[PDB]
Amino acid sequence: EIKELLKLGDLPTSGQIRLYDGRTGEQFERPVTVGYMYMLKLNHLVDDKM
Amino acid sequence: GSVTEFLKPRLVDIEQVSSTHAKVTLEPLERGFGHTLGNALRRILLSSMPGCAVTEVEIDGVLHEYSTKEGVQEDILEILLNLKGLAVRVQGKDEVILTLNKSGIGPVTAADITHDGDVEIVKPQHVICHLTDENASISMRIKVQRGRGYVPASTRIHSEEDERPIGRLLVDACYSPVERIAYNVEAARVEQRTDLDKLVIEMETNGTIDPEEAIRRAATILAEQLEAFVDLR
Amino acid sequence: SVTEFLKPRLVDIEQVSSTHAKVTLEPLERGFGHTLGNALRRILLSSMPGCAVTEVEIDGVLHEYSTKEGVQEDILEILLNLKGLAVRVQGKDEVILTLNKSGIGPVTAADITHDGDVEIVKPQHVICHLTDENASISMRIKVQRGRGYVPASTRIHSEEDERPIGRLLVDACYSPVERIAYNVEAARVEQRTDLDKLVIEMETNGTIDPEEAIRRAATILAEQLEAFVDLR
Amino acid sequence: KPLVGTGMERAVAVDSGVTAVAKRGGVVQYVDASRIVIKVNEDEMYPGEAGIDIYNLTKYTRSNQNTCINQMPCVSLGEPVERGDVLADGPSTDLGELAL
Amino acid sequence: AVVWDILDEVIREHPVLLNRAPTLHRLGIQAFEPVLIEGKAIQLHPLVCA
Amino acid sequence: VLGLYYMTRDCVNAKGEGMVLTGPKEAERLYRSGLASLHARVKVRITEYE
């Protein structure tokens, strides 16, 4: 089902894409997994501990 | 032959699909030149481009960003966030004052902003707030200035403005009008000469900056920096 | 003014040797060090014009692995030595040179047929060793002016398959740089600590000092850019 | 909102006390940054009642771990509202779904 | 800012000790020659971090 | 360790296989100029010491 959803989305079926390094402008030889993820901030801010 | 010589690139074509989306083409380019030029241009365009931004807001009856007004649907913090998204072009001044007054129920949009003839609001459709009562009214003053890069409010107050007033508020200024840059390179066809490349750049920006001026400015900065290399002992 | 940018100072150059040198710049704006270093490395590697030796012909040789007695080293070793030959020609872009020697020991570039248009920078370089008397080496080598780098599989074509028995092909390392590297670090000024400081380490054969090469690369890039900069 | 959720977000967000839930169905008459006024429909209102309910949002207060607590309305004038609907989001809530 | 210049002058050769609780074995305390960075996180070299 | 492992792993067929490099500097050049992949097997002239 994940693959089918991706295919309807016109994204690569494997979920990996080609990618370029911004700092040089070249291309990584390996495909890379790029996607969307859900992230949290954990209430251990540095300025509360230093 | 002419191995020591070069062809030179020119802006052979420029296309605009929207006020935000633009495409530019450089031709001809020699082998390998395309990638280095594209990378340098992308870098400089993302980093440097001068921009016009919203810095200071003053609203009557409001003392700090965490308060709330009677008639506004959103909190003050939300409307500050909305103003941060505003994009505006100013021509004659290095800083300018904008004025807004609205009353009556309805959305308030950048079209309602009162402006001078040297100020262009690119996208008046950008909403700011909603007024939900007939007697509710909003009256605010905005300060707009020009700078490079991005500067946080912390360092802004660290500039130590003498005698900070109470009723004025500070936001981060994301001056940079360039939002995304892509470059592509393909085989050219000029005069049926071999080993020639056509370069294309696509950009999405705030409708403020002219794409052609943007590329010329980037190349100017790059050449200026290289001049210091040219001088070396 | 928004157009302001912290131009660097040529803060130092340190020459380990005529061929090996380091050049440092400080300070630069965030992210400018990387772009300048990358662009320079690209131009040095792929676009520097140079003069290089591309073909060798020897009477007794048909292929790169053709056996030859008397010579100490194999044919591929002499091919590598030719590839390493530091040479610069100021006259024609296409020159043919011949070497013929009978002697025990090294065969240095000093024994090449000299010409006023061409300078061998390192005559002390050894092409091979000839083991015995009454043994001879006889060759003709071809030198060309070109840009960038070309390996064997690139230059070979069916359009040029019409080759005689005595033709061998050498990778033309036109660009005189042997190695380019750059690294980026942090530098501080005016209590600012968001800056780029740049270091370039460079090795090139004896054709030119690295400073001259860097200046040439900068000039090439500027001349490329020049059609865009409407400013003074 | 989280893209890859688990459906549980609705139940948790409504069941916690932070969000303001529509205790009586009707139509939203008035909204501002801090007050919600809802006209109860004719059938749902009890005899002798005014037919209007009001809610006041906890605008800003010290949470028990110094974080903010804020309630933001997420409806507009005249939109119908239903029994058990969420009128005002709380911290880490969007449209009544958990938004950590 | 002259205080910042003085501060950069003082520490130039002044080693400091870094300790991680619990100090299971004597490697747990080590000496380093500091370098000054804006921010609030202490930066280690990964090799010794291992 | 991952980087070194990738750097030293060879493959049966790669860009520029079998060519001869007069020195490791030329190997670095050919890699950075993109005419040969790291994994390609090649003969190289190398000096060592004891």
Task: Walk me through the structure.
Chain E: It comes from Escherichia coli (strain K12). Chain E: Belongs to the RNA polymerase beta' chain family. Chain E: DNA-dependent RNA polymerase (RNAP) catalyzes the transcription of DNA into RNA using the four ribonucleoside triphosphates as substrates. This is part of a larger assembly, with 2 copies of chain A, 2 copies of chain B and 2 copies of chain E (50 residues). By secondary structure, chain A is α+β, with helices and mostly antiparallel strands. Chain A has 1 helix and 2 strands, in the order αββ. Chain A is flat. In chain B, the strands form 5 sheets. Chain B has a 4-stranded antiparallel β-sheet with strand order 1-2-14-13, with helices on one face. A 4-stranded antiparallel β-sheet of chain B has the order 5-9-3-11. Chain B has a two-stranded antiparallel sheet with strand order 4-7. Chain B folds into 2 domains: 3-50 and 176-233, RNA polymerase, RBP11-like subunit (Gyrase A, domain 2), CATH 3.30.1360.10; 51-175, DNA-directed RNA polymerase, insert domain (RNA Polymerase Alpha Subunit, Chain A, domain 2), CATH 2.170.120.12. By secondary structure, chain B is an alpha+beta fold. A two-stranded antiparallel sheet of chain E has the order 1-2. The longest helix of chain E is centred in the first third of the chain and has 9 residues, at 2-10. Chain E is elongated, with a radius of gyration of 13 Å. Chains in contact: A-B, A-D, B-C, B-D, C-E, C-F. The interface between B and C is large, with 41 and 47 residues.
